Amino acid sequence: VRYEASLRQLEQRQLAKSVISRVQSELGNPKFQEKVLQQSISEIEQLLSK
Amino acid sequence: RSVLKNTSVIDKIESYVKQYKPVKIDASKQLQVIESFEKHAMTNAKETESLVSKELKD
Amino acid sequence: KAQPTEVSSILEERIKGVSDEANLNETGRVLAVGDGIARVFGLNNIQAEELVEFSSGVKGMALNLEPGQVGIVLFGSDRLVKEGELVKRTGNIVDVPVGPGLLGRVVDALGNPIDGKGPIDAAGRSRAQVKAPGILPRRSVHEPVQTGLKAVDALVPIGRGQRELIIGDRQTGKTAVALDTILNQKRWNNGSDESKKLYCVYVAVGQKRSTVAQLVQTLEQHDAMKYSIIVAATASEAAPLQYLAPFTAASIGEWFRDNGKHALIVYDDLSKQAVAYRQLSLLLRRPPGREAYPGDVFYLHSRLLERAAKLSEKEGSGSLTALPVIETQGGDVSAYIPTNVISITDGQIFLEAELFYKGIRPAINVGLSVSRVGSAAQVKALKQVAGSLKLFLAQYREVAAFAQFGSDLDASTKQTLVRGERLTQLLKQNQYSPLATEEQVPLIYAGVNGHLDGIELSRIGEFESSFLSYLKSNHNELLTEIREKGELSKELLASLKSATESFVAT
Numbered sequence: 228v229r230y231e232a233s234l235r236q237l238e239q240r241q242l243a244k245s246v247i248s249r250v251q252s253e254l255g256n257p258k259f260q261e262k263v264l265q266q267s268i269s270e271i272e273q274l275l276s277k
Numbered sequence: 278r279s280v281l282k283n284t285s286v287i288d289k290i291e292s293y294v295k296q297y298k299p300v301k302i303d304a305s306k307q308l309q310v311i312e313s314f315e316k317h318a319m320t321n322a323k324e325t326e327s328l329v330s331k332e333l334k335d
Numbered sequence: 336k337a338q339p340t341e342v343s344s345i346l347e348e349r350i351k352g353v354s355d356e357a358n359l360n361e362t363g364r365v366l367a368v369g370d371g372i373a374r375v376f377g378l379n380n381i382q383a384e385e386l387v388e389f390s391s392g393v394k395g396m397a398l399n400l401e402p403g404q405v406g407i408v409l410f411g412s413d414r415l416v417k418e419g420e421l422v423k424r425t426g427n428i429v430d431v432p433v434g435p436g437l438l439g440r441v442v443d444a445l446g447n448p449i450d451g452k453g454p455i456d457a458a459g460r461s462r463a464q465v466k467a468p469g470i471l472p473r474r475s476v477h478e479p480v481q482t483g484l485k486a487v488d489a490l491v492p493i494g495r496g497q498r499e500l501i502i503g504d505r506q507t508g509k510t511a512v513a514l515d516t517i518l519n520q521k522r523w524n525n526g527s528d529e530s531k532k533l534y535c536v537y538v539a540v541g542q543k544r545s546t547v548a549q550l551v552q553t554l555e556q557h558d559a560m561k562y563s564i565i566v567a568a569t570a571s572e573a574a575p576l577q578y579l580a581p582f583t584a585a586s587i588g589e590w591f592r593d594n595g596k597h598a599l600i601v602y603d604d605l606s607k608q609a610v611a612y613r614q615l616s617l618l619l620r621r622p623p624g625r626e627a628y629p630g631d632v633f634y635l636h637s638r639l640l641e642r643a644a645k646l647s648e649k650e651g652s653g654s655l656t657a658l659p660v661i662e663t664q665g666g667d668v669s670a671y672i673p674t675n676v677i678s679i680t681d682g683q684i685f686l687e688a689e690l691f692y693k694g695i696r697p698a699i700n701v702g703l704s705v706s707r708v709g710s711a712a713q714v715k716a717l718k719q720v721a722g723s724l725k726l727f728l729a730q731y732r733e734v735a736a737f738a739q740f741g742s743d744l745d746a747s748t749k750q751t752l753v754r755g756e757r758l759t760q761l762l763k764q765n766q767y768s769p770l771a772t773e774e775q776v777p778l779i780y781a782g783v784n785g786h787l788d789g790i791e792l793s794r795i796g797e798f799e800s801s802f803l804s805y806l807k808s809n810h811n812e813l814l815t816e817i818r819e820k821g822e823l824s825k826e827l828l829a830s831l832k833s834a835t836e837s838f839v840a841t
């Protein structure tokens with residue numbers, strides 16, 4: 228049981244450095260451009276709602 | 278057993294325990310020697326008991 | 336595998352759902368961060384002691400409000416909170432997760448678990464600054480807290496709802512009393528009745544990381560972690576965490592108090608909480624008092640320890656019992672801090688350094704350690720067979736400095752001197768072996784009535800385990816009688832005297 232919990236911790240830290248890899252994957256995109264549209268429509272959704 | 282999601286051994290050592298579930302028996306082997314020791318003890322005891330019962334009334 | 340990523344993606348939906356309703360009637364710029372505290376412009380609708388969140392994850396409590404700006408204390412190192420960032424306000428007075436799901440976990444002061452066993456199954460949030468229960472839903476204490484130590488339940492008994500102080504010195508065996516009490520509650524935490532179970536919340540403030548690591552390892556060796564709650568505020572982390580963490584743990588205790596169950600809490604040690612409080616009040620220009628603890632440091636330990644008593648039947652007969660620990664300086668009982676914890680708690684267990692220097696562990700000084708409402712809530716059996724024991728140790732303490740002259744004396748002082756030395760050597764105890772009251776009664780009973788007087792002084796330590804195994808093998812029914820009845824009748828007393836004089840004879 229102890230070793231199972233240790234293997235789960237190793238899986239989580241591998242996916243943590245994979246999250247770092249996903250940050251590196253995301254930050255090169257023109258989602259930097261395309262996502263301003265997402266904020267635009269989202270502010271339309273928020274501020275109209277009151 | 279439901280704790281270990283990747284079980285693979287708990288049925289193995291479960292069967293290993295149920296293999297050795299007739300673990301090992303004890304010994305009340307003494308039915309020849311222990312009767313000899315209580316025989317000598319009861320002999321000396323009855324001798325002393327009757328002797329002091331005689332010697333008190335004497 | 337990806338199962339925590341599934342759970343975290345559900346939490347992403349919550350974060351994205353929260354982003355669809357995020358309009359923070361609050362945000363203000365950080366004017367200046369200095370002295371480990373931040374000044375914030377804006378936030379024109381904030382509350383006093385409202386939790387806020389800076390733009391780097393460091394949370395904060397807004398403890399003062401001024402016309403113009405609001406002063407927010409930090410909850411970590413100030414390395415993260417930068418000038419000119421963004422201050423959303425959360426919306427809450429400072430709360431922590433309470434409920435039964437924390438049993439087994441190790442959290443710090445804000446309910447963030449740091450064991451590595453997933454999120455807290457939290458049955459609710461509760462304020463840190465709860466008003467103490469007033470004088471009407473209180474009942475005077477009438478139930479024992481069997482600590483399992485010999486000398487504690489002999490001399491200074493603890494009631495459910497009786498705030499008792501463990502005061503002592505550095506490396507003199509202070510933590511071991513609370514740890515042995517938590518390990519003694521295994522007698523009932525394995526059991527079935529709720530009103531005899533006793534949950535332990537150990538609140539380490541100001542201590543090292545590795546000490547709390549070893550203490551979690553100890554409470555998982557002897558299996559206490561099905562009922563333990565560790566609130567750790569280790570000395571690496573910054574000062575308002577240590578100012579907060581015993582209060583949040585007192586909220587954890589009040590959750591068990593209002594819901595009928597009984598629970599023990601251990602503060603360890605509040606002489607570092609007052610260190611953290613004098614740090615937070617000497618960085619806000621508030622002027623110091625006697626020995627530079629700020630003038631309200633009585634009020635701090637007041638509003639902490641007063642959230643622990645015995646609720647009566649009107650509220651559900653729950654309870655909360657506190658053992659704060661105070662590190663003095665060289666056997667002192669008259670600095671400004673240990674004369675404020677004493678003037679709150681219902682008594683002291685003064686663990687004097689000189690007796691531990693002679694190895695008598697635990698080193699309770701009997702003539703100083705006293706309890707005020709302990710006597711009305713002891714187990715009935717010990718109160719029947721130790722009503723002489725406090726007065727007898729007072730008698731032996733009277734002739735302590737009189738026998739140092741080496742002068743030949745009468746017979747009565749020699750008799751009391753031998754019996755007093757046998758009782759002093761008798762109350763020793765190894766680590767992690769609390770003795771239940773069902774076994775504390777016969778050992779003290781052999782001590783009181785002169786049966787030990789033929790034994791040499793060195794054999795007493797093995798006399799303890801020998802007489803215990805003699806009663807465990809043969810007179811098991813007497814131990815069950817003391818367990819069930821909790822009281823020695825005349826027949827029980829005569830049978831116990833026979834069972835003593837049997838084993839005393841050899």
Ligand SMILES: Nc1ncnc2c1ncn2[C@@H]1O[C@H](COP(=O)(O)OP(=O)(O)OP(=O)(O)O)[C@@H](O)[C@H]1O
Pocket residue numbers: 504505506507508509510511512662696697764765766767
């Ligand atoms: N009954 C006992 N058996 C064996 N060792 C003991 C016993 N009681 C105390 N000690 C020793 O006392 C030492 C310190 O224990 P403890 O942590 O209670 O002291 P302390 O003053 O609380 O230290 P700190 O204040 O740093 O927590 C330990 O090393 C432990 O070995």
